[PDB]
Amino acid sequence: MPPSERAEKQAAAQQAVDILHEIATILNCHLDRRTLSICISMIENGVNPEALANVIKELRVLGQDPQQLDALVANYLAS
Amino acid sequence: GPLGSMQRINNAIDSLIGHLVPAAAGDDDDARTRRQAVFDLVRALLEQPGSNIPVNHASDLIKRRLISTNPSQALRFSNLYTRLLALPVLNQKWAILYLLHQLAD
């Protein structure tokens, strides 16, 4: 891929994040650009998007609920 | 599929865990044990088969959602969707929009 196309694709990637983050805001997804960009990367690498949405939901629960994080650890250690 | 991308996916998972689960982000033993437990959960979640998602499917779900929630920006979403489709980047636009629809609140 020649320099012009690489530069155009890098510029379009940035517009993609801008567009998708504005969509995410309209939908009230509570995603910041950092999390959105990570998700974009995983989805572009083949991750199932319904599973990734569950991942985001569960990580949010664990980050807000020390009871559930410690329960997760107890289940993990028991395996 | 994720075949051949396991390294880049796991690096992203590491980043997600540190960003979204602060108690799992530190350097002490307990935080690192929490990180491993969270990592194992994420891996299991991403293996789950999920539904038959069939594309205008996610965008149609988002539009019909936006007539109930928040009709003032339905047109704005439609213009954003059109712009996105024209970009010469991203091979899985349908799935990113599906992700947003699932997280919509």
From TrEMBL, chain A:
One of its GO terms (biological process) is mitotic spindle assembly. Keywords: Cytoplasm, Cytoskeleton. Pfam families: MOZART1. It is found in: Cytoplasm, Cytoskeleton, Microtubule organizing center, Spindle pole body. InterPro entries: MZT1. One of its GO terms (cellular component) is gamma-tubulin ring complex. Belongs to the MOZART1 family. Required for gamma-tubulin complex recruitment to the microtubule organizing center (MTOC). PANTHER family: MITOTIC-SPINDLE ORGANIZING PROTEIN 1. Part of the gamma-tubulin complex. This is Mitotic-spindle organizing protein 1. It comes from Chaetomium thermophilum (strain DSM 1495 / CBS 144.50 / IMI 039719).
From TrEMBL, chain B:
It is found in: Cytoplasm, Cytoskeleton. Transmembrane segments: none annotated. It comes from the Eukaryota. Belongs to the TUBGCP family. This is Putative spindle pole body component alp6 protein. The lineage of its organism: Eukaryota, Fungi, Dikarya, Ascomycota, Pezizomycotina.
